Curated annotation (Swiss-Prot):
Broad class of where this protein is predominantly found: membrane
Similarity field: Belongs to the NlpA lipoprotein family.
Membrane topology: Lipid-anchor
Gene: tpn32
Keyword Signal: yes
SUPFAM superfamilies on file: Periplasmic binding protein-like II (SSF53850)
Pfam family, one: Lipoprotein_9
Keyword Cell membrane (UniProt): yes
Protein name, UniProt field: Membrane lipoprotein TpN32
Amino acid sequence: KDETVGVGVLSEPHARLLEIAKEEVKKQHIELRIVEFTNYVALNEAVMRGDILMNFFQHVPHMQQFNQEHNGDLVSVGNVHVEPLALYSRTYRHVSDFPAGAVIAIPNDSSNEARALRLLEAAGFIRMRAGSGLFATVEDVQQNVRNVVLQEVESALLPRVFDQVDGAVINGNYAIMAGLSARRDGLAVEPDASAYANVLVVKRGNEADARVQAVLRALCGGRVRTYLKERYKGGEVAPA
Ligand code: MET
């Protein structure tokens, strides 16, 4: 009898957070159906077509990129958590250990590629051109200080090529799934993780939907905040 609303998810840690949310909104007689997808575009297109009411897997710059490129009308209804982006290495233990010519793999979707490039800039490896913007890519690199080779790779595959490159800038969700902690294993962290807070997203016009608001309240509630602080003591995933 409870009405059902679908929420698209990509992977941990968002999936576990939606499971906590599912239990909580069940109390208001809302049955949260967690729908599992395999790629970024499919998740946003499903919300645009109306196959699911919301999704939970990206940050605002990514959503903005999708709106611009795919004529989307998605909006964030709230920040939920931050997952710091970090540079990891299969062998080097210090950022200054990287030899000239070292190969560093980074995300290939523009908003996370820019984010990763600004992380490497902050660590002193490169300098980005001035009017680069939120969707900057390797073509925007103005100077290569440490003489590094930057390889663009699909985010989900970064952990798979990790043992074959000198380093890799890996999104927190994929790093955690591969046993990497930005605090314990990272050699450098992005300069502004809070700007890349992950958000609950819906089509413009559904922000006030009462079911959406309940899921949001549950994702930002004391029980989720408590869960995060306890499971990710290094702040790998932290309430926004
Ligand atoms: C699809 S945008 C990237 C989301 C990812 N969980 C991150 O915060 O790096």
